[PDB]
């Protein structure tokens, strides 16, 4: 007979704070072609896309969410990208019994089943850095940690999660300092209580300000280890900032030896995943559909998560299969898709795809250290299987990592 059309209502940020839809929409289009051309996944169903440009704006997204829900055809799932767009659609979704699957939202707040009961994300939460941090603290035998953050909900939530994770490992947070824009008084305070192991959470502009202030107070050297986020631009510390007094040399000096954690978004292995593509082939195939270069295209590094989200849905819809009967007033099919989505376990272009109880993606983390003004891969950590890959590439002045104490 005929394959029944089954619809996804997606929102792609083509502009805004995170213009991730630029590469994620083509990656979504490619994944649908790959799933629909597979006779073994949904033989009786054809998965189709209906999308709108959210502009990474919740106000804008409210207009398109209406457009998706109040116009035929009925959609079985909603796929937002930006964290602010997901916070709005994932909360609203229960009124239309809709599963919500995000390909780009990292906000820790989205891992709340009370506010977001049908929510899943192939993009991990910013809290995924915390198990890697506690493991590195354990490896190097540290139990006294200082934390410094910029005043943002994401950074406060990340540190709130780090508090409960260190308590479990018999580790404590000595000092916690915050700053809206100027980090002069928080860094001066770290020096005063003689903090040794510091977890610093801030954006790049604020990192430059933190590390200039770190040079001045000599909060770098053999004594100190800084744990930062690994998503900053290459040579961020060398970038010219007129509001910073420190020189390139001074700040290449201040950042020396610091550790970074970064969520793995593309499998570094040359293995073939469920689609039978390799990471390298996915990248080459994606580069071909793009109008501009990967460097110019927003959401290029997140594009494999968007590709994997379509596969997670396809495989979940495959496990259940009466999809045309879906209506916004019925929980039946939703709860069955929810159960199938919750039981996700497959190999995607981003690596192994699994969700925790909150619907947040579980993934590997890349651990790097800045050695001689350049980041060097010192290993990877898999939080779900407590698997640490050590490179034996890390370097310390003492010939060994220092300690939390005087």
């Amino acid at each position: 007979s005929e394959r029944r059309a089954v619809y996804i209502g997606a929102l792609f940020p083509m502009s805004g704070g995170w213009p991730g839809g630029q590469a994620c929409q083509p990656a979504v289009e490619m994944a649908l072609e790959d799933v629909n051309s597979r006779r073994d996944i949904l033989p009786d169903y054809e998965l189709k896309l209906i999308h709108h440009d959210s502009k990474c704006d919740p106000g804008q997204a409210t207009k398109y969410l209406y457009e998706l829900l109040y116009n035929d055809p009925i959609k079985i799932i909603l796929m937002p990208g930006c964290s602010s767009v997901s916070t709005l659609v994932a909360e609203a979704a229960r009124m239309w019994n809709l599963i919500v699957l995000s390909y780009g939202s990292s906000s820790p707040a989205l891992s709340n089943r009370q506010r977001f009961p049908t929510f899943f994300r192939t993009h991990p939460s910013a809290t995924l850095h915390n198990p890697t941090r506690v493991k590195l603290f354990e490896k190097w035998g540290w139990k006294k940690i200082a934390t410094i953050q910029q005043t943002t909900e994401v950074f406060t939530s990340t540190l709130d999660d780090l508090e409960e994770r260190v308590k479990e490992a018999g580790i404590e947070i000595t000092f916690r300092q915050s700053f809206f824009s100027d980090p002069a008084v928080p860094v001066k305070n770290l020096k005063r209580q003689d903090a040794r192991i510091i977890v610093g959470l801030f954006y790049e502009t604020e990192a430059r300000k933190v590390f200039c202030e770190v040079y001045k107070e000599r909060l770098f050297g053999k004594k100190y280890v800084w744990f930062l986020i690994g998503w900053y631009a290459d040579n961020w510390f060398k970038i010219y900032d007129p509001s910073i007094n420190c020189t390139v040399d001074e700040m290449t000096e201040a950042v020396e030896g610091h550790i970074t954690t970064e969520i793995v978004m593309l499998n570094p292995a040359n293995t073939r995943s469920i689609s039978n593509m390799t990471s390298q082939e996915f990248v080459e195939k994606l580069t071909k559909r793009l109008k501009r270069h990967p460097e110019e295209t927003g959401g290029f590094q997140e594009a494999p998560l968007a590709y994997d989200a379509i596969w997670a849905l396809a495989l979940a819809l495959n496990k259940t299969s009466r999809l045309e009967d879906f209506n916004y007033n019925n929980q039946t099919i939703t709860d069955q898709i929810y159960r199938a989505m919750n039981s996700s376990s497959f190999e995607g272009v981003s690596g192994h795809v699994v969700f925790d109880a909150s619907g947040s993606r579980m993934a590997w983390t890349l651990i790097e250290q800045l050695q001689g003004g350049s980041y060097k891969k010192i290993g990877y950590y898999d939080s779900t299987k407590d698997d640490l890959s050590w490179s034996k590439t890390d370097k310390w002045i003492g010939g060994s990592p220092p300690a939390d104490d005087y």
């Binding site: 919740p58 409210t62 207009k63 109040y70 229960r94």
Partner: protein
């Protein structure tokens, strides 16, 4: 009589606690709608208010709004938005349907951001509107040095944050800034130790009883101290662990409470031809068994703002309305421009907006033996303070000094 449809959005259900604001204001709304029709003020048209229940919930509220657009008549504007998170969602999206919104109860300062909420207006002053009033009070009593005590909850930290800008370029020093989450006693100890005399408090009713208990224990009360705290607490709130009731009342004695003025005290005829006193009587008869709400005057004046806006928008069109779909950007812009012209004497005083924000009246109260008593008002339009002679009092021969 073609209808001019208005989308009324508010919690109306008994199952929702804020449902009392929505129901409390409906008799005031009915009185304004009645007079406008009875007097045919918008002839040929009649003001058609449709009501949709938000249930003070983000999801139910958004669906109520979506269901109003889908199945309801063509609304020209939005009237309501009570709960802060629901109002923020609706207010942010307004341009998508070219809908101007007028709220009578959402006081969250967040909504003053016209980059995020350009189509949003409110007849009620925001939580931050107490700050230019407090500046006037400090200037009046020559208080040049203050300390702050704030609860670490967004509703209060937003007010404290705004105070910084209000007191900048003025001759007033914030000598000590103290915050607390659950217990204010450590923060009250620091203020005492820094010899603070004038305290600007921003915390809830539950925390207020704790604050004044710590104040008694630290002797941060009497002739040398002045506490300036929220004026919106339930009456007899203090009656509702270590301190005694007599010791709480001793420390509370003379605190200044600050909040918006529910209705004008001026015995002058408003736009409807009634004085605020005559309106208040008409509202109390109309409400019957429904519990009164302090936002009733704001809802009443809110309907008059809509009627006046529509009259002016009708004049603008006549110079060069049924055709309005949520598509007409130009009609929405006309409605927006006409609302910005609002200038009339309402039951809540003069109704004027400064960038969608109400310029209104702030009430000053003083706790005297058993209750809060009115001691003054601040007029935001004129930026003036009027202190009620023979009401405000101090335990010493002079008001306290700031050091």
């Amino acid at each position: 009589s073609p209808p001019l449809s208005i989308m009324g959005l508010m919690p109306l259900t008994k199952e929702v606690a804020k449902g009392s604001i929505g129901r409390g204001v409906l008799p005031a709304v009915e009185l304004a709608i009645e007079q406008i029709r009875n007097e045919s003020l918008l002839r040929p048209y009649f003001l058609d208010l449709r009501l949709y229940d938000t249930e003070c919930d983000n999801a139910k509220g958004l669906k109520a709004f979506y269901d109003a657009i889908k199945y309801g008549p063509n609304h020209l504007m939005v009237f309501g938005g009570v709960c802060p998170s629901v109002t923020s969602i609706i207010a942010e999206s307004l341009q998508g349907w070219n809908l101007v919104q007028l709220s009578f109860a959402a006081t969250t300062p967040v909504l003053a951001d016209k980059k995020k909420y350009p189509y949003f207006f409110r007849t009620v002053p925001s939580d931050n509107a107490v700050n230019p009033a407090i500046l006037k009070l400090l200037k009046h009593y020559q208080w040049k040095r203050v300390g702050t005590l704030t609860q670490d909850v967004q509703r209060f930290s937003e007010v404290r944050n705004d105070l910084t800008g209000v007191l900048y370029g003025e001759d007033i020093e914030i000598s000590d800034t103290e915050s607390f989450s659950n217990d204010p006693c450590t923060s009250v100890k620091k203020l005492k130790g820094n010899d603070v005399r004038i305290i600007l408090g921003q915390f809830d009713q539950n925390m207020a009883a704790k604050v004044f208990c710590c104040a008694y224990e630290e002797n941060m009360y009497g002739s040398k101290y002045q506490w300036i705290i929220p004026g919106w607490y339930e009456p007899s709130w203090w009656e509702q662990s270590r301190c005694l009731r007599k010791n709480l009342l001793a420390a509370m004695e003379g605190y200044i409470g600050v909040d918006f003025e529910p209705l004008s005290s001026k015995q002058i005829k408003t736009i409807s031809g009634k004085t605020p006193q005559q309106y208040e009587r008409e509202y109390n008869n109309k409400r019957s068994g429904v519990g009164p709400s302090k936002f009733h005057g704001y809802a009443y004046d809110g309907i008059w703002v809509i009627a006046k806006t529509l009259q002016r928008a009708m004049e603008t069109l006549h110079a060069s309305i049924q055709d309005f779909n949520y598509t007409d950007h130009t009609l929405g812009r006309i409605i927006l421009n006409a609302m910005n012209e609002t200038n009339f004497f309402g039951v809540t005083g003069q109704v004027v907006f400064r960038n969608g924000e109400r310029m209104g009246t702030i009430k000053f109260t003083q706790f005297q033996d058993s209750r809060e008593v009115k001691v003054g008002e601040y007029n935001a339009v004129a930026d003036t303070l009027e202190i009620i002679n023979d009401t405000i009092r101090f335990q010493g021969s002079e008001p306290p000094k700031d050091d």
